[PDB]
Amino acid sequence: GIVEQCCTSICSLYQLENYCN
Amino acid sequence: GIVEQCCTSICSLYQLENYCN
Amino acid sequence: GIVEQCCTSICSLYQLENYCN
Amino acid sequence: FVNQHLCXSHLVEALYLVCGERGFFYTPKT
Amino acid sequence: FVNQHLCXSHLVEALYLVCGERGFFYTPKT
Amino acid sequence: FVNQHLCXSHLVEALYLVCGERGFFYTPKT
Numbered sequence: 594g595i596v597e598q599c600c601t602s603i604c605s606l607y608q609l610e611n612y613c614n
Numbered sequence: 615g616i617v618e619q620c621c622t623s624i625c626s627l628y629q630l631e632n633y634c635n
Numbered sequence: 636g637i638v639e640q641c642c643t644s645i646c647s648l649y650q651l652e653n654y655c656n
Numbered sequence: 657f658v659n660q661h662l663c664x665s666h667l668v669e670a671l672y673l674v675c676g677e678r679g680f681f682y683t684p685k686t
Numbered sequence: 687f688v689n690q691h692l693c694x695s696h697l698v699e700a701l702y703l704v705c706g707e708r709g710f711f712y713t714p715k716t
Numbered sequence: 717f718v719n720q721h722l723c724x725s726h727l728v729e730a731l732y733l734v735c736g737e738r739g740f741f742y743t744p745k746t
C-alpha cells in the first residue's frame with residue numbers, strides 16, 4: 594500500500610521511487 | 615453547506631454536481 | 636516559525652506578508 | 657470518481673474538474 | 687483573504703500568491 | 717526531499733515530480 598507507506602508513515606525519496614514505472 | 619456535505623462527509627459525483635452553475 | 640504562525644494558527648494577510656522578500 | 661473527503665483547495669479543484677464549462681459556485685458557510 | 691489554517695503545499699501557494707514579484711522565503715522550523 | 721506525510725493529491729504530485737519520464741502508478745488500497 595502506497596497510501597499506507599507514504600500517507601500514514603514517511604517515505605524516503607527511495608521508498609517513494611518504488612512506485613515509478 | 616458544501617463544506618458540510620463534501621468536506622465533512624463524502625459527496626458522490628452527483629452531489630458534487632449540485633454546485634455547478 | 637511560519638509553520639507555527641500560519642499552519643497551526645491563522646495568519647491574517649498581513650502576518651503572511653511578513654514572509655515576502 | 658473518488659470516494660473521499662474533499663476540503664478547501666481540493667474541493668475547489670474537484671468542482672472545477674467536475675463542472676467543465678458550466679463553471680460553479682463556492683460559498684463556504686460552515 | 688481566507689481565515690483558515692494554511693499548511694505545506696497550501697501555505698507555499700498562499701505565499702506565492704500574496705507576494706507577487708517580491709518573491710518570498712519558506713523555511714519551516716517547527 | 718521532504719520528511720513529511722504525503723497524502724492524496726500531494727502524494728500524486730510527489731510521484732509525478734520524483735518519477736520524471738518513468739511515469740508512475742497510483743493504486744490506493746488501504
Ligand SMILES: [Cl-]
Nearest residue numbers: 666696723726
Ligand atoms: Cl490537506
Ligand SMILES: [Zn+2]
Nearest residue numbers: 666696725726
Ligand atoms: Zn491538501
